[PDB]
Amino acid sequence: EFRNKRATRGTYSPSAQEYNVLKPPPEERLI
Amino acid sequence: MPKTISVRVTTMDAELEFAIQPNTTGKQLFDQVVKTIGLREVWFFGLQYQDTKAFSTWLKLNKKVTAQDVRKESPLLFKFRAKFYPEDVSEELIQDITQRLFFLQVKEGILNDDIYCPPETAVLLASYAVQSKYGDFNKEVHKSGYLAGDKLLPQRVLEQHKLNKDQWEERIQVWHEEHRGMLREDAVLEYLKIAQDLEMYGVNYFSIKNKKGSELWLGVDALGLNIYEQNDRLTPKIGFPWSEIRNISFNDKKFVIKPIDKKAPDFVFYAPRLRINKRILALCMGNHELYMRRRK
Structure with a gap:
């Protein structure tokens, strides 16, 4: 779903992603 | 670095003041902002700042404020803005x-x-x-x-x-x-x-080139990614709803969109800088997250 082992590369797979308080802002995951 | 760090946060119509500490996280600052203004619908918003290279940068919430590339300024300045x-x-x-x-x-x-x-x-x-x-x-x-x-x-x-x-x-x-x-x-x-x-409205535009070297725009919005001719930012040339994207990735300036059809070829574009591809991927991940949340 997400790979980021190098500061200069990144990858994310939308199609792969599947499904108290109001939810927080999305958090940036990149290095 | 001092024990107490003055911060100014500007919303569209207010200047707010806070005091943080060396270990304060972005989330802790963000929570103080939204509590102050009585905002519950927080998921669209973020804190932007000018980094040491004078580029606008979103604050990471799950990291210490002082561990990020904020400037040597007192008070630290942030803009509270809708990101999504x-x-x-x-x-x-x-x-x-x-x-x-x-x-x-x-x-x-x-x-x-x-x-x-x-x-x-x-x-x-x-x-x-x-x-x-x-x-x-x-x-x-x-x-x-x-x-x-x-x-x-x-x-x-x-x-x-x-x-x-x-x-x-x-x-x-x-x-x-x-x-x-x-x-x-x-x-x-x-x-x-x-x-x-x-x-x-609601579209983040980025300057890109295709493999032939033609100038284009890439748009990221709530619904997916779009490619536009240089001279037409109103109507996409190519559209990629989230459901049609198998993968998006970058290496330095090169950005790749892989369609869900495994037999179809990847789309390749070139951004001005690594920083821009990081911005694109972050906005894609965040928009897609909210898109799914709406439909849970």
Whole structure:
């Protein structure tokens, strides 16, 4: 779903992603 | 680095002051901001700052503020802004504060020409901004020239026509009078309902090139990614809804979109800098997250 082992590369797979308080802002995951 | 760090956070219409400490996280600062202004609909928002290279940067919430590339300035300066936009304001923005913050941020982009707006629509939007500021038109108080002090129209609209300010005010005033009886908060909402149908609303545009070296734009919005001809940011040349994207990735300046059809070839584009590809991927991940959340 997400790979980021190098500061200069990144990858994310939308199609792969599947499904108290109001939810927080999305958090940036990149290095 | 001091034990107590002064911070200024500016929303579209307020300057706020906070004191953080060396170990304070972005999330802790963000939580203080939203609690202060009474904002519950927080998921659209973020804190932006100028980094040490003078580029706008989103603050990471799950990291210490001081561990990020904030400048050697006191106080530290941040702008609180919407990073993500709803698919429909009527489905998601219930609070007055949230509507107002979106209204002011969007209006700023309309007025500075960042968000294209047809002239007649610009006049109608202006009239809702006026209803919000002034309430019901009243011939006894709102005499000719009552709008003289306001910046109400996009610079492109002013420059491309040969109306003077009085002539524009006349068009806006007629609409203003039509809005009689409308709550100021309802005028803000109506403004947003009109603005959200503009083709450039809610789209993050990036300058890219394709393999042939042609200049294009990449747009990221709530619904996916789009590729636009250099000279047409209103209608995508190619659209990629989330459901049609198997993967997006980058290496330095090179960005790749892989379609869900494994037999179809990848789309390759080139951004100006690594920083831009990181921005694109972050906005894709965040928009897609909210897209799914809406539909849970």
